[PDB]
Design a protein around this ligand. Structure first.
Ligand SMILES: CN1CCN(c2cc3c(-c4cccc(N5CCNCC5)n4)n[nH]c3cn2)CC1=O
Length: 273
């Protein structure tokens, strides 16, 4: 009975993902996030090993929630008559990257390097677990303000990772690649790299580079803030129009702009405290 196991707090947010509340596990006072999703609104369904009908999100979270890392872990879940309820890790104090950027404006490159690196490690972890996130962006990353650690959230638009083409997409359009816009097709890793380019631009410029379909399709990157040449180069590389022209994760992390990253804790002490 989830009713008695958790003390429900205030609404943290709601939108396309459903409704997410602050909570506390009664047994040990562990801070949690309680996410409700209506079944009528669940588009993609999946199956547990033990053969049970469940939201793909839950399948993806399980595959990815084993071990430590930069992904928010699924602690438990429940099925209700017309909804599923997910119990998720909740860091505290925390702020999502979108609000963080809005507040501080464009980030110092040293900070953006540390954040971006951690996002890369998290996404690599998902891919190693057979999971494609598909909605990488500032709103889907949490910053643990005390530890300097980022955490990927919201796998509700995700899919099992495969090497064949995807012909469906339900992530954020302004983060979707030109091949989706033009052809309604993309491959997982290379689409992910494109969204990482948007994300990195967003961090160092304090806003998204493209707003309309035609800008995405043109792929011309204009910098509105001062950004080093190395960083501009990495961004333009991630945002190559031809998917095959984009860097692999390894090539991103071996890029000269990516060298000498701060540890998360160093990052918090310098930039967060
Ligand atoms: C799209 N989306 C956004 C909220 N999300 C989430 C938030 C949290 C949080 C959390 C903690 C503190 C604040 C906070 N919100 C996130 C929304 N923006 C305000 C801060 N979320 N902890 N754990 C979470 C797990 N998922 C579920 C989800 O699917």
């Amino acid at each position: 009975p989830l009713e008695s196991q958790y003390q429900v707090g205030p609404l943290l947010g709601s939108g396309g993902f459903g409704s997410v509340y602050s909570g506390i596990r009664v047994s040990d006072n562990l801070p949690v996030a309680i996410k409700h999703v209506e079944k009528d609104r669940i588009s993609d369904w999946g199956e547990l090993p033990n053969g049970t009908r469940v939201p793909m999100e839950v399948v993806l979270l399980k595959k990815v929630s084993s071990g430590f890392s930069g992904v928010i872990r699924l602690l438990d879940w429940f099925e209700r008559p017309d909804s599923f309820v997910l119990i998720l890790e909740r860091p505290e104090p925390v702020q999502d990257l979108f609000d963080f950027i809005t507040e501080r404006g464009a980030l110092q490159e040293e900070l953006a390097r540390s954040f971006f690196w951690q996002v890369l490690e998290a996404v690599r972890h998902c891919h190693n677990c057979g999971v494609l996130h598909r909605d990488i962006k500032d709103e889907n990353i949490l910053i643990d303000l005390n530890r300097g650690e980022l955490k990927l959230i919201d796998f509700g638009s995700g899919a099992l990772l495969k090497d064949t083409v995807y012909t469906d997409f339900d992530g954020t359009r302004v983060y979707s690649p030109p091949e989706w816009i033009r052809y309604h097709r993309y491959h997982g890793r290379s689409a992910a790299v494109w969204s990482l380019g948007i994300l990195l631009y967003d961090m160092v410029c304090g806003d998204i580079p493209f707003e309309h379909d035609e800008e995405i399709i043109r792929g011309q990157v204009f910098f509105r803030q001062r950004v080093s040449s190395e960083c501009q180069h990495l961004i333009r590389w991630c945002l190559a129009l031809r998917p095959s022209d984009r860097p692999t994760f390894e090539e991103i992390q071996n890029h000269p702009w990516m060298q000498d990253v701060l540890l998360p804790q160093e990052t918090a002490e310098i930039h967060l405290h």
